[PDB]
Amino acid sequence: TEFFFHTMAGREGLVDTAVKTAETGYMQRRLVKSLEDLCSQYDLTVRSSTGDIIQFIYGGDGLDPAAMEGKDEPLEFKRVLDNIKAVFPCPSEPALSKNELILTTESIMKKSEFLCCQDSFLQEIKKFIKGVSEKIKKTRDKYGINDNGTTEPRVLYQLDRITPTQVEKFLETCRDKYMRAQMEPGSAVGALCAQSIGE
Amino acid sequence: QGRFRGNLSGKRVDFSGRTVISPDPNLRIDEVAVPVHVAKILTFPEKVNK
Amino acid sequence: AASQAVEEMRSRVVLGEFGVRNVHTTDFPGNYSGYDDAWDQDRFEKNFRVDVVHMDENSLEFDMVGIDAAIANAFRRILLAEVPTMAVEKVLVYNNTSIVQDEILAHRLGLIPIHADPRLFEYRNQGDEEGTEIDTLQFRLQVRCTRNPHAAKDSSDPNELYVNHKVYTRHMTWIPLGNQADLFPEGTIRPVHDDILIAQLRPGQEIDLLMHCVKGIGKDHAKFSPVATASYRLLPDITLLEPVEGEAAEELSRCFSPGVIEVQEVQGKKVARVANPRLDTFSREIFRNEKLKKVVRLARVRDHYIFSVESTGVLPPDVLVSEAIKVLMGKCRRFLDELDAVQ
Amino acid sequence: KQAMGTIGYNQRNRIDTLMYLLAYPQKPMVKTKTIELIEFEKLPAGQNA
Amino acid sequence: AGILFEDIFDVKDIDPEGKKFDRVSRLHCESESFKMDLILDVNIQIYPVDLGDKFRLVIASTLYEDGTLDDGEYNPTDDRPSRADQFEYVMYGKVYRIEGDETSTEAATRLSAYVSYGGLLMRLQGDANNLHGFEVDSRVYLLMKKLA
Amino acid sequence: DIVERHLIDGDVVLFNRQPSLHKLSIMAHLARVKPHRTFRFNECVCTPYNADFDGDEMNLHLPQTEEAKAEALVLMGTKANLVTPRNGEPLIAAIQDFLTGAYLLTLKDTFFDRAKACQIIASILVGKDEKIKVRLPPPTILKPVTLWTGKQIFSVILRPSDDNPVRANLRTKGKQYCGKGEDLCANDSYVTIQNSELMSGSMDKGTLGSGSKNNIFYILLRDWGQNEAADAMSRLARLAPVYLSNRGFSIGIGDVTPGQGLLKAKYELLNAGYKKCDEYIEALNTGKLQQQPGCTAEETLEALILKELSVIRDHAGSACLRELDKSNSPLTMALCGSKGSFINISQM
Amino acid sequence: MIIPVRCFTCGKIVGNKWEAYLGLLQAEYTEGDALDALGLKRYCCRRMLLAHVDLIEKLLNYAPL
Amino acid sequence: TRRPEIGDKFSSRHGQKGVCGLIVPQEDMPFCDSGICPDIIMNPHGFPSRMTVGKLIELLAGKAGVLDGRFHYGTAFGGSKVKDVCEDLVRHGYNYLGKDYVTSGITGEPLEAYIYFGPVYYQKLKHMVLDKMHARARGPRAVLTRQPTEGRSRDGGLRLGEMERDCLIGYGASMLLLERLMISSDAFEVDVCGQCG
Amino acid sequence: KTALEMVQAAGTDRHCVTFVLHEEDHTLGNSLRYMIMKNPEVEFCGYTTTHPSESKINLRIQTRGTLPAVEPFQRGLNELMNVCQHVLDKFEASIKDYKDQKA
RNA sequence: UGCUC
Ligand SMILES: Nc1nc2c(ncn2[C@@H]2O[C@H](COP(=O)(O)OP(=O)(O)OP(=O)(O)O)[C@@H](O)[C@H]2O)c(=O)[nH]1
Ligand SMILES: Nc1ncnc2c1ncn2[C@@H]1O[C@H](COP(=O)(O)OP(=O)(O)OP(=O)(O)O)C[C@H]1O
Numbered sequence A: 001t002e003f004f005f006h007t008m009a010g011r012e013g014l015v016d017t018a019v020k021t022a023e024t025g026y027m028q029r030r031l032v033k034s035l036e037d038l039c040s041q042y043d044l045t046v047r048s049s050t051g052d053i054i055q056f057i058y059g060g061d062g063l064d065p066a067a068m069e070g071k072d073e074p075l076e077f078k079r080v081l082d083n084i085k086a087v088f089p090c091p092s093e094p095a096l097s098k099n100e101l102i103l104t105t106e107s108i109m110k111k112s113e114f115l116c117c118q119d120s121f122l123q124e125i126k127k128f129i130k131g132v133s134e135k136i137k138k139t140r141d142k143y144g145i146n147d148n149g150t151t152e153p154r155v156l157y158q159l160d161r162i163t164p165t166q167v168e169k170f171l172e173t174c175r176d177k178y179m180r181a182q183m184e185p186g187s188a189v190g191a192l193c194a195q196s197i198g199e
Numbered sequence B: 001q002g003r004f005r006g007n008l009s010g011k012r013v014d015f016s017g018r019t020v021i022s023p024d025p026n027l028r029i030d031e032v033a034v035p036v037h038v039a040k041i042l043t044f045p046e047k048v049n050k
Numbered sequence C: 001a002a003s004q005a006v007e008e009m010r011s012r013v014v015l016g017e018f019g020v021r022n023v024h025t026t027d028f029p030g031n032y033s034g035y036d037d038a039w040d041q042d043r044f045e046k047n048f049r050v051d052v053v054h055m056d057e058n059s060l061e062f063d064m065v066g067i068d069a070a071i072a073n074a075f076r077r078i079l080l081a082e083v084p085t086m087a088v089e090k091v092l093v094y095n096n097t098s099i100v101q102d103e104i105l106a107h108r109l110g111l112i113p114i115h116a117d118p119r120l121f122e123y124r125n126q127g128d129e130e131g132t133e134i135d136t137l138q139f140r141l142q143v144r145c146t147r148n149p150h151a152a153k154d155s156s157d158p159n160e161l162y163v164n165h166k167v168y169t170r171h172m173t174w175i176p177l178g179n180q181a182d183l184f185p186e187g188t189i190r191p192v193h194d195d196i197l198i199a200q201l202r203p204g205q206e207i208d209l210l211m212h213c214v215k216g217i218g219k220d221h222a223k224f225s226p227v228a229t230a231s232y233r234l235l236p237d238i239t240l241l242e243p244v245e246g247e248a249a250e251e252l253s254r255c256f257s258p259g260v261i262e263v264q265e266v267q268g269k270k271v272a273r274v275a276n277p278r279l280d281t282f283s284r285e286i287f288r289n290e291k292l293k294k295v296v297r298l299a300r301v302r303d304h305y306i307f308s309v310e311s312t313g314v315l316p317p318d319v320l321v322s323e324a325i326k327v328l329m330g331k332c333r334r335f336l337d338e339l340d341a342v343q
Numbered sequence D: 001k002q003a004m005g006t007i008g009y010n011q012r013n014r015i016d017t018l019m020y021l022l023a024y025p026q027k028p029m030v031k032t033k034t035i036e037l038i039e040f041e042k043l044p045a046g047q048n049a
Numbered sequence E: 001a002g003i004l005f006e007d008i009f010d011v012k013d014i015d016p017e018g019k020k021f022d023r024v025s026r027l028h029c030e031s032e033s034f035k036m037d038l039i040l041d042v043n044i045q046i047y048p049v050d051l052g053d054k055f056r057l058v059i060a061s062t063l064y065e066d067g068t069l070d071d072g073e074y075n076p077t078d079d080r081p082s083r084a085d086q087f088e089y090v091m092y093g094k095v096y097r098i099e100g101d102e103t104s105t106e107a108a109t110r111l112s113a114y115v116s117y118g119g120l121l122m123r124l125q126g127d128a129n130n131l132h133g134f135e136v137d138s139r140v141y142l143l144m145k146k147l148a
Numbered sequence F: 001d002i003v004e005r006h007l008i009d010g011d012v013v014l015f016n017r018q019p020s021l022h023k024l025s026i027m028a029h030l031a032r033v034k035p036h037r038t039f040r041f042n043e044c045v046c047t048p049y050n051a052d053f054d055g056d057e058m059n060l061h062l063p064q065t066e067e068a069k070a071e072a073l074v075l076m077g078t079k080a081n082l083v084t085p086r087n088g089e090p091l092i093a094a095i096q097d098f099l100t101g102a103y104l105l106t107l108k109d110t111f112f113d114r115a116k117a118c119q120i121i122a123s124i125l126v127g128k129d130e131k132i133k134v135r136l137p138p139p140t141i142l143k144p145v146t147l148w149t150g151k152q153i154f155s156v157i158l159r160p161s162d163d164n165p166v167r168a169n170l171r172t173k174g175k176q177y178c179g180k181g182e183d184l185c186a187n188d189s190y191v192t193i194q195n196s197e198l199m200s201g202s203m204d205k206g207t208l209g210s211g212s213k214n215n216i217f218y219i220l221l222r223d224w225g226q227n228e229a230a231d232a233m234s235r236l237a238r239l240a241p242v243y244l245s246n247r248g249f250s251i252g253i254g255d256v257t258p259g260q261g262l263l264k265a266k267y268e269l270l271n272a273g274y275k276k277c278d279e280y281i282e283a284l285n286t287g288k289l290q291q292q293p294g295c296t297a298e299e300t301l302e303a304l305i306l307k308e309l310s311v312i313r314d315h316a317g318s319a320c321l322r323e324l325d326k327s328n329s330p331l332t333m334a335l336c337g338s339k340g341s342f343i344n345i346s347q348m
Numbered sequence G: 001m002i003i004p005v006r007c008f009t010c011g012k013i014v015g016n017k018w019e020a021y022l023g024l025l026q027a028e029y030t031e032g033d034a035l036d037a038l039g040l041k042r043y044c045c046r047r048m049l050l051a052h053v054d055l056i057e058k059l060l061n062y063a064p065l
Numbered sequence H: 001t002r003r004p005e006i007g008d009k010f011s012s013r014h015g016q017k018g019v020c021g022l023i024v025p026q027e028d029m030p031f032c033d034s035g036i037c038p039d040i041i042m043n044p045h046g047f048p049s050r051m052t053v054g055k056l057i058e059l060l061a062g063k064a065g066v067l068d069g070r071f072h073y074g075t076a077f078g079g080s081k082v083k084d085v086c087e088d089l090v091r092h093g094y095n096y097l098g099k100d101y102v103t104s105g106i107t108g109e110p111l112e113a114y115i116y117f118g119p120v121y122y123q124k125l126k127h128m129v130l131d132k133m134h135a136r137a138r139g140p141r142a143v144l145t146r147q148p149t150e151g152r153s154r155d156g157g158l159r160l161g162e163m164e165r166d167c168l169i170g171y172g173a174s175m176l177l178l179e180r181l182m183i184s185s186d187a188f189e190v191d192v193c194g195q196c197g
Numbered sequence I: 001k002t003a004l005e006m007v008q009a010a011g012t013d014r015h016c017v018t019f020v021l022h023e024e025d026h027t028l029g030n031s032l033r034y035m036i037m038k039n040p041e042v043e044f045c046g047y048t049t050t051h052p053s054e055s056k057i058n059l060r061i062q063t064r065g066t067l068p069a070v071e072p073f074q075r076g077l078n079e080l081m082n083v084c085q086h087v088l089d090k091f092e093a094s095i096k097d098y099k100d101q102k103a
Numbered sequence J: 001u002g003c004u005c
């Protein structure tokens, strides 16, 4: 009886998959035949074949879903900061405090190459910088680390160690990733959407 | 099997083959092994240059 | 202590209940601090030895002590593949009416070993299908099955009704070429077993064919493999952590091979001891008894390999081992000559 | 249903558009009673390796 | 001398979570001179240990006592007077994390150095004054010698 | 003049599986001629094609135009399509016999001598890797015995040579991570890599598989380009098999047999469940049974019986997992996530 | 169809021990003791001789003759 | 007369259909203490997801049978139990679980884990690579629509179905799609009048 | 044309060398690996197979100091040849004395 | 129709 019930379940699954194959095949055919006309133009506006605009900007922001590092987000600031700290450790430079970190961030972000970047990404960068600066402040207040750089135990500076070089590297890497993660004009976005919804 | 679906949207082409696959981890991910028998049939037109 | 553990790791291979440990060769310079494992020809020649324990026709068993697993495996693989022998390669068929397929018949004939000495022949050059007197041998096989003129009325058994209905390999006749008849005496060139059943015929059917055999190595095709089973195993050495006596001694005797553990009455009570760890095959049946797990310690000697070579009968196994070592030396000499020519 | 093996004792005289035969077919070692009932051991379609 | 730290520890537990690994064990040890706790992965197959064992442990920047920090490459075949001659169990690792203690919400003075000897984890936790000289991305030598 | 040359090495060739669900079902690869009669490719690319090497026939097309060749190589390049456009997750990653191999390699029990370590490192020095230095990493334990851990051997794949600018960094959780160790888990399931050196954790499907983000190959692709990730994947595919074969990994009937305590627990659980089911049946048939909200009494009994059976199932599975000893091939393959899971083990 | 000459796994000559094996079946010997007397220690040759079916005579019964 | 090669499909009487991936020499195959080398090496990763314990039971029963010269029965809802075959294995001096001590043939060193050896009844299927291998040159075309034929027996070429066109569109390779569906398949040059169309 | 040498890069560094050997297999590769690994002047020694289809192997040798990594190769070859000669002589003597004592 | 996947 147990073997018969197991065979029943197996055949049920088999027929389910058999119906699913054809059903999803038809659905994919329809979705692709309907969405094969859209394309990303050079002015960041998704337009149909007749010239009508479907979206003034793809996804509201204009980022490539294939180049999405985070969960529906362009970058994971924590991972990028850790990678920058690990790849470029500067032992000959002192650590930065909250005020110094905020000052260098505001001075670097106001450059020309950062003007063309979207405002939301800059606001997210500012929020992450403020968060890490508050964390550094809390750490230094817990361990009484002085911003002057004359504390006797230097190992205390290794808890949250940040140098302006690492800050600049992090900002440049984030900007480059955000610029290279945008929708490249000419891509058949409609067909990609149809396939990603059909599969 | 109509003309739109059978002869315009999807149609048969030449210079193509169909064969069974087998594993081979000694090749790169961007590389594929082709048998000598099929390689001698599928030809590529190269233009004589300097 | 730590020294005992290091010694057990570098000398013994322990087999656990779930997995084997200390399986990698580590006796190399730089791996051990208190040991100078640098290569020394004197120590190798001193510690190395070979002792033959059994040697009969087409069967040899010998223990090599001092050699490493690498050279042991090299010798094994050379014997398996890189030892050349003679085997049927080309088959010329003349009106084969047998039910057995021509290709299947040629394949079966290719697997039949030949007693010819391969050292007296040479490899056939590329092509040259005609073959020369130096690098080929010819075997004619002509069998015509017919009804027995004198047989019983019923004669239900095929033996009485028909004659030559089973084409054994003894019907193969070696046809000398050139001066092979003078060099090889009569009876030397012949099938090894002389009893291999090639095919079965019926009256009216006839098998007439010629077989050209040339020299070849086992790597090209398995039909040239001289050794039927050439393998080696590490010498077991069973040790008892604590003296086991009583009916547990009989349990031990029943767990391992019947010929490795022996029970003796030294003071009227049965006590078990290792008699001959050679016969043990490490069935790992002692792990079933819960109490007798922590009383034994199965291990294999790293520098003691028992080689067992059972051949197909082309030539004795000692000459096979000699030719394997000679082929390895020839490869080494060829590579040395190539290197010298490079520089 | 697509296994390769012998068809019958008259497979040599039989001439079909497509036939597959095995050189050295061997009967299974773990054979079910149904195999003995259908006499499949007499016409095996595989080898024990 | 490149000795960054040196202290005698006593083991208080061998496997608090059970016998996970056959060759490696997670020893927990406490120091006598200071309140330095050590959670160290040790290879018991080659260097066996017990519960009541007391051993001297030294974390140094270089393996040579003369102060030569030329550690570009290590040649096991080279024989020369080194610090390892005075110890029994020598490992080579890198101090890959320095984390401040989070249990004390305020007025915290305890830190912890996590070192990875080829995967073997070693957390040395205690007062920051004893961890002087420890820096991230710094390769060091651990030397353990059992005492009577 | 035009010469119809044979298909030689270096020619871009389209390779596709007839049933296509997404665009990654067809990719442009580089053709290499081989004497056999089958299409062979790296198994790490099986997930996009969804192939299983069980008799599937795949199609191979040869473009007849230089422009088409260049477009196929650039847009449909295997190195340029390591991620799907659906959610950006990497599809071209490790697969069975590569996740288990890397897992067993990076286990804390692995300790290799100089000979075995050098052999495993040379196992990948083929092709373009023949013009680079080995860079043998220093040994971990050197005084008692010079032993190279398997994690260093695995990291050598990330940074084989000195001049290689690959500096991989990752910090994530494994499948069997407890949730409190924070890089000190008793199971050592917290993956931590710094400067292309495996500092902590064991590799599994969560880090080498094609499941989701946080994959080492994904980080390499997003940090150092496509070529570095492709080279790392090739090195892994060339190293893991050699070590897995030299070590030995097999499954037998003894790896799935139940223990005495397991049988006792199963018997007790079955007795308890049958007793509770009989009690519920008696309560419903004779008397008033507590009716669950949003359903009738019969559906309430159905739900209660299903709950009791699921309790029996999960308790038997937990008992079997607790009684099973380490080094068990099914348990290892379920832990590393290569193939199977705990449910299949409990069922079988 | 017919007993193979060589064993698949090892390669020991087993074709010459077929008819003799049949003789052991004509005698009172069982399968195990017969295979043991023939000198087949490893189980590969035991499987080769035991799992083999003799179909050559059944085909010869259909041969032209 | 065809010999098994790379691409030939093989079954093991348990639905574990597989294709020959590689043919390694005999010297490369691992060997046990008795010197037996395996003919077929299968992937164990197929057991957990498929739970084919029946294959392991069949292998153990076959090993016991070939050791004691018997034919065990795998009858459904019955047959020889595991205990009987384990007793038969331990009586003949072999392991009671099939796993045996094996030495690596390549490196010559013993394996850390025991290998599960035993006789399994493998059956070869009619699906061969030689019959399925296909390659199409220019070749002939159909009269109605000048395109390659369909079947291999008819010397037909492969079909770039609608899904292949969808994938090529998603990739954006316009020139590749044009060369496939226009240049290399049904290219032609017609004459159109610019006045009447 | 059987055994060919290759430098680690275009700089022609004699410290790291690669010997590509033709018509060989794991036998001689492993034998020479074991015989040359015992040379104290060898940092890294490793043999590999390019592809099972073609019959060729690639050995790689990196020494400690300024050794050309070619002299260790000849050293290992000569040591292997000497070991082969010694084991051959020992086996011949063993077989001879066994035949003598058997009769 | 049978199949293969
Ligand atoms: N043997 C065989 N039977 C077929 C074939 N095509 C169809 N049939 C059988 O005929 C029935 C369906 O007929 P169709 O396939 O519709 O025939 P059709 O396509 O209208 O015929 P044509 O237009 O001449 O191709 C099925 O029940 C099949 O068993 C074929 O190619 N071979
Ligand atoms: N009708 C079909 N349409 C599309 N693809 C198919 C069809 N039939 C088979 N395939 C191909 O075969 C694959 C189906 O295998 P899958 O269902 O995943 O395993 P399976 O056949 O259930 O094997 P198990 O029974 O799990 O051992 C996926 C698909 O590419």
Ligand SMILES: [Mg+2]
Residues within 6 Å of the ligand: F051, F052, F053, F054, F055, F056, J005
């Ligand atoms: Mg499939």
Ligand SMILES: [Zn+2]
Residues within 6 Å of the ligand: G007, G008, G009, G010, G011, G012, G042, G043, G044, G045, G046, G048
């Ligand atoms: Zn055999």
Ligand SMILES: [Zn+2]
Residues within 6 Å of the ligand: H193, H194, H195, H196, H197
């Ligand atoms: Zn007109």
